[PDB]
Structure 1
Amino acid sequence: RWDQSDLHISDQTDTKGTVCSPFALFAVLENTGEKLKKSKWKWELHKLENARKPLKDGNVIEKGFVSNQIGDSLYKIETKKKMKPGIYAFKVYKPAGYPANGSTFEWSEPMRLAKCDE
Structure 2
Amino acid sequence: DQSDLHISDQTDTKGTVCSPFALFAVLENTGEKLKKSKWKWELHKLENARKPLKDGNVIEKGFVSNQIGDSLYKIETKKKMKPGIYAFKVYKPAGYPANGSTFEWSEPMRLAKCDE
Question: What TM-score comes out, normalization by structure 2 length?
Answer: 0.85
Structure 1 residues 97 and 25, CA gap change in structure 2 (3 angstroms): farther
Tell me which residue corresponds to 2:59: 61
Structure 1 residues 98 and 32, CA gap change in structure 2 (3 angstroms): closer
Structure 1 residues 115 and 15, CA gap change in structure 2 (3 angstroms): farther
* Sequence identity (%): 100
Structure 1 residues 22 and 100, CA gap change in structure 2 (3 angstroms): farther
Question: What TM-score comes out, normalization by structure 1 length?
Answer: 0.83
RMSD: 2.4
Structure 1 residues 96 and 64, CA gap change in structure 2 (3 angstroms): farther
Q: Which moved more, 1:82-91 or 1:12-21?
A: 12-21
Q: Displacement, 1:37? A: 2.5
Note the residue ranges of structure 1 that are not aligned, 5 or more in a row.
none
Q: Displacement, 1:72? A: 1.7
Q: How many residues align?
A: 116
Structure 1 residues 15 and 106, CA gap change in structure 2 (3 angstroms): closer
Q: Which moved more, 1:33-42 or 1:86-95?
A: 33-42
Q: Displacement, 1:53? A: 2.7
Would you say the 8 A contact 1:28–1:75 is kept in 2?
yes
